[PDB]
């Protein structure tokens, strides 16, 4: 049992994520990384206006089969 | 003006009753989203000054932390030259609107006290008081009683 | 077939077409325009020469992965070396690819070591830590400096920084005192001329009259349409406090999923009950907590209340025409001036950008805008748009258009040029928006022809390119004298994070 995801950029193509709901925030970010060369620290993640932290799962936010992905720049300060 | 209104709130709960560690609590009579104060150390190397910080609140606040910046220098590895603090609880990352700057002044007086040399500013300085602790307080002993401002009665 | 120990990817490892190896200096990270800032401004450059813990991760330097990509080829190697019973006398070529990789790899571990020592006297590379944050060595000044598709913009924001990092901004426009450069550090001193000042002294005058900014939102259609069942009067209060809540919150919640679903598909799972962090919306929350409403609060109040509570802010730009309207009613202080100012100035110098990398024009737009009467009255154009309701960006286009020949432009913007300027601007600047500072950015093109490129997340210019100025030209490359060029020539300046092997 394992889903097909949909990651939004703002204004580029959507792209698909081969996961199942045990995987991290994270792992998403890094799988995207993967397809895209974008590092997760680069990465801010929206679903339904909902921000996910890196470290929850995929069941925490509620998240399976098909869901839409809102992907945007995150920027990096100390 | 919500940000507004939650900062009269949060005033009115400081002139009832109010922080000894914040002292000469002036606000911007038209906003209220820039605040100034004293904030009086309690240990070594700071127990002998006093500093003025400015609090900064976005309009977005409290969705939004507010800022601080220190306007009297200070010898510290997690202050700025320039006064900028990195705080945990300001940070976007953890902040929660329910925190009142009441708690936020709380954890300044805290990384004031007990330095943090994991993310510091200034890796200069966080290098001497990891090692060579006695010269630094020394350092700053001095920094303080120069640059510092003068403790309240 | 045989386990292959060499990665299809490395950091700041990209081989082209015609097997060459070309590594890749990163300035700053990011894609287009620079996201680092504040205490990580230098990170991508302090990690590729001395490698980074911070969060206390492990992260190597480009000298030490180029040994452990190395060491994956030397193995690579033996164990075909090993197999040659079966051995075609070739692998198809395999082998003859994965030995060049070798020998390039090589000779950019000779060269990282020849710039620590002997070409280091200057001490650009060795300048962490040593100046607060480090500033740009100089070999990166010079290839910023000559670059036709990568430029550092700075603005004016009302409380300014003394320093920039970028020495030669393609758009540069007057700036006030930094408090930082004050016998008391306790205020900017204002300059009273220049664009800066003119937009935020028009926006938010003397006279403190506020500016309105007249938009209907969809945000503010909802709300209307939520509110048409209310009456003026209405309130949360009696017993039935917590129940009249949860029926408002739940109009609410359906009108504006209504209205979110209409363009945005993605909005039909958004739910208004709990915060990011999970807490139930209520009236304890709301009032006690966050002291926010109360009983006598209208029902506009109690709205607006948990919209700001419980959505992501992403949710209301997706659905808006542009960053001009954030969705603020009006213009009521310097800060909110202040920031308009700045998304006025950030759109110039986009157009600034568009105009230079197109080769419309080599002009600093800045210059020209600071001169009056252009910056009292493009700032006096602006006042109007917000009040008529009017969009912002062709009104910048529009007083462009009318200067064109000043400007170092042989004809007007199309419509067409106006909108790739307009949809540049609304990314990169939506990208910077919360920006701890407004000082400067450096926006970057990698599809275009140029020494700037998009390599993993970094905006990095090429190895060689640095290397060579500056040691100066005192020492050649062998083997590598034309990679640098090579890479230019590539179909495109944007490159992928990947190596092809097989």
Not at chain 3, 14 to 24: R, T
Not at chain 3, 492 to 500: M, T, V
Request: proline share 5%; with cysteine; net charge negative.
């Amino acid at each position: 049992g394992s889903m097909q995801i949909f990651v939004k950029t703002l204004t580029g193509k959507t792209i698909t994520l081969e996961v199942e709901p045990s995987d991290t925030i994270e792992n998403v970010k890094a799988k995207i990384q993967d397809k895209e060369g974008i590092p997760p620290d680069q990465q801010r993640l929206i679903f339904a206006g909902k921000q996910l932290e890196d470290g929850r799962t995929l069941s925490d936010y509620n998240i399976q089969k098909e869901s839409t992905l809102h992907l945007v720049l995150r920027l990096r300060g100390g | 003006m919500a940000a507004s209104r939650r900062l009269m709130k949060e005033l009115e709960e400081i002139r009832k009753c109010g922080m000894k560690n914040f002292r000469n609590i002036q606000v911007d009579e038209a906003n209220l989203l820039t605040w100034q104060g004293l904030i009086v150390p309690d240990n070594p190397p700071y127990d002998k000054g006093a500093f003025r910080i400015e609090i900064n609140f976005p309009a977005e606040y409290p969705f939004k932390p507010p800022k601080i910046t220190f306007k009297t220098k200070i010898y510290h590895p997690n202050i700025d030259e320039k006064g900028q603090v990195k705080l945990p609880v300001i940070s976007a990352e953890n902040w929660k609107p329910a925190t009142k700057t009441d708690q936020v002044i709380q954890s300044l007086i805290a990384l004031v006290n007990d330095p943090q040399p994991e993310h510091p500013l200034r890796a200069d300085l966080a290098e001497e008081y990891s090692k060579d602790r006695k010269k630094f307080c020394k350092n700053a002993e001095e920094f303080t009683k120069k640059y510092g401002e003068k403790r309240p009665v | 077939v045989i386990k292959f120990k060499e990665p299809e990817r490395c950091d700041y490892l990209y081989v082209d077409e015609n097997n060459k190896v070309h590594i890749l200096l990163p300035i700053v990270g990011g894609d287009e325009i620079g996201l680092d800032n504040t205490a990580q401004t230098a990170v991508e450059l302090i990690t590729f020469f001395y490698g980074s813990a911070h969060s206390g991760v492990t992260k190597y330097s480009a000298e030490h992965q180029l040994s452990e990509y190395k060491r994956q080829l030397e193995e690579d190697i033996k164990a075909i070396n090993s197999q040659k019973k079966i051995s075609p006398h070739a692998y198809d070529d395999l082998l003859k690819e994965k030995i060049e990789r070798l020998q390039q790899i090589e000779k950019y571990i000779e060269l990282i070591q020849v710039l620590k020592k002997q070409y280091d006297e200057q001490n650009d590379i060795r300048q962490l830590r040593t100046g607060g944050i480090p500033q740009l060595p100089s070999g990166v000044k010079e290839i910023i400096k000559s670059s036709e598709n990568a430029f550092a913009v700075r603005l004016s924001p009302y409380d300014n920084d003394k320093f920039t990092r970028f020495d030669d901004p393609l758009f540069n426009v007057k700036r006030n005192i930094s408090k930082y450069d004050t016998p008391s550090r306790q205020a900017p001193i204002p300059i009273y001329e220049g664009l800066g000042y003119r937009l935020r002294s028009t926006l938010f005058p003397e006279d403190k009259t506020p500016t309105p900014i007249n938009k209907k939102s969809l945000r503010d259609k909802v709300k209307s349409t939520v509110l048409s069942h209310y009456k003026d009067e209405d309130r949360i209060d009696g017993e039935k406090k917590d129940e009249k809540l949860n029926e408002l919150i739940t109009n609410l919640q359906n009108e504006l999923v209504k209205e979110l679903v209409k363009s945005d598909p993605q909005y039909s799972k958004l739910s208004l009950s709990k915060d990011p962090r999970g807490k139930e919306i209520n009236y304890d929350y709301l009032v006690n907590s966050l002291m926010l409403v109360d009983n006598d609060s209208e029902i506009g109040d109690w709205i607006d209340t948990i919209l700001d509570a419980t959505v992501d802010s992403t949710v209301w730009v997706a659905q808006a025409s542009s960053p001009f309207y954030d969705g603020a009613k009006e213009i009521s202080s310097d800060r909110d001036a202040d920031k308009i100012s700045i998304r006025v100035q950030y759109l110039l110098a986009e157009a600034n950008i568009y105009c230079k990398t197109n080769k419309l024009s080599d002009a600093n737009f800045g210059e020209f805008f600071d001169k009056e009467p252009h910056a009292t009255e493009i700032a006096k154009r602006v006042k109007e748009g917000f009040t008529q309701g009017a969009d912002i960006e062709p009104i910048i286009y529009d007083y462009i258009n009318s200067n064109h020949a000043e400007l170092g432009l042989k004809s007007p913007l199309t419509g067409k040029q106006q909108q790739e300027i307009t949809d540049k601007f609304t990314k990169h600047y939506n990208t910077i928006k919360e920006s701890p500072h407004f000082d400067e950015f450096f926006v970057a093109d990698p599809d275009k022809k140029g020494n700037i490129f998009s390599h993993q997340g970094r905006i990095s210019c090429h190895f060689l390119d640095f290397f060579t100025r500056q040691t100066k030209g005192k020492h050649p490359l062998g083997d590598l004298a034309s990679h640098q060029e090579a890479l230019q020539e590539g179909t495109s300046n944007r490159l992928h994070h990947k190596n092809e092997v097989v």
